[PDB]
Symmetry: D2
Subunit: 442 residues, 4 copies
Amino acid sequence: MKFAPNFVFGTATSSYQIEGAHDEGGRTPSIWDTFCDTDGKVFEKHNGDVACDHYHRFEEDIQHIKQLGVDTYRFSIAWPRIFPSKGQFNPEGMAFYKTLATRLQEEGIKPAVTLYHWDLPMWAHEEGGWVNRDSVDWFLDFARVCFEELDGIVDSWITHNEPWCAGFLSYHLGQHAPGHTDMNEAVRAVHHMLLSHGKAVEMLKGEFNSATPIGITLNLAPKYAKTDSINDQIAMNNADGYANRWFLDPIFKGQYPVDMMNLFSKYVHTYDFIHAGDLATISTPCDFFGINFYSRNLVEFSAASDFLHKDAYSDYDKTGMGWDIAPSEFKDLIRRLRAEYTDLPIYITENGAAFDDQLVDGKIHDQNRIDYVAQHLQAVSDLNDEGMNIAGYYLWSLLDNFEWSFGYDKRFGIIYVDFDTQERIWKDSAHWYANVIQTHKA
Amino acid sequence: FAPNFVFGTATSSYQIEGAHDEGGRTPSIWDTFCDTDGKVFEKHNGDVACDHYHRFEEDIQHIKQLGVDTYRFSIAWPRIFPSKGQFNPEGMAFYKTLATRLQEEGIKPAVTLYHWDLPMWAHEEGGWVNRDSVDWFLDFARVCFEELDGIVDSWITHNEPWCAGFLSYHLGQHAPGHTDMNEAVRAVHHMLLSHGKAVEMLKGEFNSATPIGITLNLAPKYAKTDSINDQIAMNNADGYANRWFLDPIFKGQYPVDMMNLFSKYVHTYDFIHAGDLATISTPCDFFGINFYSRNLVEFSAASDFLHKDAYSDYDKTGMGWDIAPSEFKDLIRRLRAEYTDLPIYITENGAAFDDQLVDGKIHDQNRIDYVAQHLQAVSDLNDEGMNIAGYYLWSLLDNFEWSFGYDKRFGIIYVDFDTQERIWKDSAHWYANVIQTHKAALPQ
Amino acid sequence: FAPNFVFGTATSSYQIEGAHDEGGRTPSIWDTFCDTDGKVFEKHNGDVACDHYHRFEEDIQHIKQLGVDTYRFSIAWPRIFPSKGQFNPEGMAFYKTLATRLQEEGIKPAVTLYHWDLPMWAHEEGGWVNRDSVDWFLDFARVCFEELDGIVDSWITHNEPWCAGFLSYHLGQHAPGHTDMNEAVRAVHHMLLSHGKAVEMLKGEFNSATPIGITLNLAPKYAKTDSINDQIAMNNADGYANRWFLDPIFKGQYPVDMMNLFSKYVHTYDFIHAGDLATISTPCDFFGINFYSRNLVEFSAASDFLHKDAYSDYDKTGMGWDIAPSEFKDLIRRLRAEYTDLPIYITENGAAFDDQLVDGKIHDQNRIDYVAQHLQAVSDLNDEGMNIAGYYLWSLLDNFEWSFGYDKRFGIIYVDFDTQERIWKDSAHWYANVIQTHKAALPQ
Amino acid sequence: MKFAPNFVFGTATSSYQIEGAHDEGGRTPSIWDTFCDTDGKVFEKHNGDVACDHYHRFEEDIQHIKQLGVDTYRFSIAWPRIFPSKGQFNPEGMAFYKTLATRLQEEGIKPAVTLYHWDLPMWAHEEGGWVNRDSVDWFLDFARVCFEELDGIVDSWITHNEPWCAGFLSYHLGQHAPGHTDMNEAVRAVHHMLLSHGKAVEMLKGEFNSATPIGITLNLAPKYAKTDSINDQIAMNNADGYANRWFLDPIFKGQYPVDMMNLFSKYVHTYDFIHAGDLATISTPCDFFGINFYSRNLVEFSAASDFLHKDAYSDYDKTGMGWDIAPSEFKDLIRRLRAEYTDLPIYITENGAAFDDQLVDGKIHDQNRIDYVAQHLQAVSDLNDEGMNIAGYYLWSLLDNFEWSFGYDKRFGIIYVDFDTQERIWKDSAHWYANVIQTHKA
């Protein structure tokens, strides 16, 4: 495990998962506030009302981040804090992020700032949300004030976090807010996310004339055929198209994959929501490429599935989410990206694991989480020996937090959080990560 | 309840028998499915189960002490034809003895021919997807009729073709675990046609008057809202669960709304031959219903069949199923209005809850309450003229609950699967007392 | 025929009027469709047509000499509202004069409001796909009612929504020529709802007793063989052509078998709002039927709607359509058994044949024979109590036959489109004599 | 117009379209005999009972071919003459083809022999025809006796003619025999045709140890988008997949195009009829590549079409089939094939046109057919100047003949045939073609 002196270590969070203060500072509800309150959607109707109370306790968390010695803190800006109503900027909301980023710079920590990490304002939802092509303009007005007020104190920008989740998981499979099950809505939502990404990049580099590094973050889950049958090859292909190529191709090639457009045409009977110039804008050149990586999926064919695939039995070790622990597949992915897609510097903007953490005598001996991270850092190092140019690794997450549809039932943090008292207790993985970074610095 | 109302309790062969490779028994599709990775909870299987093949006398005594009029069980096809065309007298002898012993104790044997244990040899030739499955079943039913018709009180041809057909060949959750809608409609068709042919054989060729019928699981479907989309959703859920089976049996046709919907996958219906539906709808003596719950549903634009489950605020069993006795009543009234005047047996009803053994007892007041509510509904329905002739409580014993393995307990008698000890739960004592109370109300 | 049976003849505005840019008229979807390459035979159009807007007096005299009780015509929406919200008195004056003149000659005006000439301004806002089309139509119907209700004998709201909806927005053969099943179901819905709302307006707001109804083209469907696949095929052809329209109008619902089939393309039905179907099914005074032929169909595994045309050995018209008077009778009997007791007008029936002008005459014995057979069928049906109150012969004049242009002649009067000369075909003389003969049978 | 001395000129026919003698010499009916007799399927129930009576008049036709001066005569062998019943070889049927090819060699004319040109025996149809994987073996037994008895006197072999027609037009669109409309049957039929091709090639080169040149003939119709909209791009893609790539990819890449497998999965819910090794065999190396080329298609998107496309309005000059005259598109095609698919030598195994031929004073002044051929020969010459290696051109057809579902209503011949009397009358295009070949020979 050897990293170039240039390599950045990071840790990451998002606004709705940690901030709390959900109705303070002028903040109006997001699609996730109301989704948490919809029956059946979130584990035990858990919500982000209080979360990690980070809005109030940000100073303490800055100290935790300082003590880790990470070069970089990745966080998101709450859209509903900045534009709590349409066209109505909220200076109090912007002040919190201005302070946050100023304070991080003062402590010598790079702010890596995600603009959209899933907390769409309810007023936007009420007009059709991401399905409405106007969402692109709503997003640009949000990005514009962010750039006006923060570009000078931010180290890098990430436009969108996981449009597969915000698009497909949210509007097709109905597991994430706003919980719809409509493939036409989903492809329109994704398209508008990606186009909003491209336009914000053009805005930053054109009219702001800024050289701040900017890119998108995609979650990528490499897909494997259970057998070598032709059916299972189709299945892998289609799982891969649905999770990965539907996003990679527009961003890097300026095209959607026609094989997936044909498969999606069981629901989507026109593609005229893709206007001339959209794909050129989606593929506007960026400074780096962000990857959230958690696992692979083994799949096989299903004659009864619209998209011709279903999950297959996996015999791998699994995290407490039930996801495969899959570092070799992480390496397959990165090689593929370099062979097929891009030469840009890569940041692993998220990697991490939930395990059934046990608090005993004020400690958390999360050897399982240590083993997970160690394997993936090892893989990064080895990939960097092949010239794969992974510029950095941000560990998800700084803190245990609101894990979406699972609520507080799933802990991804290297720092444990008692959600009653708000106490932070470093897990063994925090102590170990701090040390790994220090060893690299020598 | 009426003086001729029957109280019962129910099991099936693979879920209780064990002795999976004894007495000439060869593997069923469930034996191999249990061994297929990812299909059954912790790869649990029916190798031992409740070891009933060995302990049947003990279980008979349990049945006797319960005071039930009826014991419903199934015949393991792989015990009877362990290979194609090769009858196994030792397998039949177990069932002949079982039924004789029940009669000797004054208990009516209600016998299910097919409760899901298709022989592997049949599966290896295409299973229920193959139209020859009708003849394979017929040969099975024929020898059962030859050897047992004199000793059984009633016959049930098929148990839950929605499960054996759709859950098994379309949704892949039950053996053999396929996910192919064309296989699944062919499978269901052959099961229903096999039922029709078995009833014709019993009444024509055997000239027997033994009551015979089919058992369907029926799950009434409700719309979340009154929007037309949600009405379409309820229509299609109800077609998929219920009407696909009820229409052929009682009307001699398949519902064309569902044929059209299924034509996203099924591009020909020529597997339905001339005469098939006339045979499927051949007249029977009763209609068996397995009832557990309702489903509340709504529309989904991204679903092939236009529906998905909607959130339910009902009290639920340990399966997460709604406790839905009012909906049971809507179901029974609907059947009388739209489908049949035949006498109805509730061939299964019951519940799984998280049973705790404490100081040798099982305080399953939740199961008691579940059953009480449905018995009350039966009684009420019978006051309306709805002619429910009996109720069989699923199940006598905790047993192998399919893809959930031994993790879900439906028994009124607890079974410790390490020791095979039977321990009566509170629900067993209570059920025995409910039957006594009903008998004490009748004039002797 | 009965003493109050009416004989008629029929046209529509765009097919005969001409003067396409005069009198304030702005273009319809057909004007622009005729100019779109590949859509209409030799890019023929309705610029001149039969020049009836100018020659109406001559045509009235022709109608008078025929002796018909009724003349059915349509009102050009682009003459009345040439722009959204801008009423055009000069356009209305033509129709006021026309109807007044018909009355003065003792001829009943049967008036079609929508016969396919949607204004381009409406099309540019989404046409019939837009729910606002209901209000646009309503404003059109309102002024027609205001200005003409006193002078018209009956109203027909819509002519052939299967054509205006499916043939136009799904199969792309008629204006505006789209091929989108979601547009097509929305279009049909808005046409039917517009009908319902217009009838409510006439009877509620205008408090008028003028008879009003809708006109559907209906094409009875037959299976090539008795296989279930061919039965499914006939079911789906009949749903697509007929039941999609009959069920909402007479039953207040859309057929769910067809909703399911159409869900290969249509993934939500929330364009049907609360109240829509109650309004669509509002009671009317008669039911209009345009009848031309049957279709024999069979199954096709490769067709979305599971059917295709089957070979027909029937005698055929110059359109290649079956000559099918027996099937006309099955249709009318079926309507009385399953849908309605309302009086029926045959608002169109007729045929195209390859007419030859020779020495100033047209010997169309083929058209005579076609019409004779259907008139005989009407008479026979009326002896059975089937209550067909009238028959309107399509058409008075050879005219613009849509995507076929002037290449197909349905008139009983021949029109030389170079000179505008009208020449009575043998069928016109014969029809006049048939009406005389019927009048001479009645006691004066 | 200059052709290498090596360039071969040809003319072409097929057995059922010219032979007649339908019930003589032991010949049993083909799927086309019975299709012609099925109501509604063929123009005026025309059939090949007599056709051009070539079975009897072959000597005269050899003389016509001689007089043309063509290097090559392309013809087909009637399967129902060779195996009129399953497993029952018919020496009388083989003798006619042995004589035919011996006589052509004696006159110094290369026989180019098509094995399957659409006349499947009714006994094969009765067992499921090309849908049945056993069709591969039935075909091999036919090919085997052909090779045994004819390889020594044949100049080249063509395994199959237009599997798009024999597969898709015949089993999906129902326009050709046996007239089915079933997409599952169609893809199975095609697959078995292609696999039978590959196996026959392996047989010829392995167990026969023969070096006779062998290849497949595909009809290829290049596809063009009406506009530059994304929808119309999808439409072009799918028209191209359906007509061309579904055949080109297996043959040259050993794969089916997954975009078309996904689109076809509206009807075809499993692809396990493609067994391991099938695609390797389908793509077995061949000596040349045969192209039947007639036209292009301009297409546009349709939301109501399963395969997302429909024909668009064409303003090009058209033949009497209504097909575009499209030589520039012919050149697009050949360039593409060299850029994307193959370097093998190409034979244009069919090119020609039907026009409303007028017989006046014993002549046929078919200037329209001359102009058509001239443009395409010109295009071949120009392509050969770019190094596109078109080794030869066979003009369809030697004779007016039975044009399938159009019967005798469509005349593709350079030699007119009175079908009452059987008289052959050279059209002006015959005289012109003869002369073009002679000019090349100088």
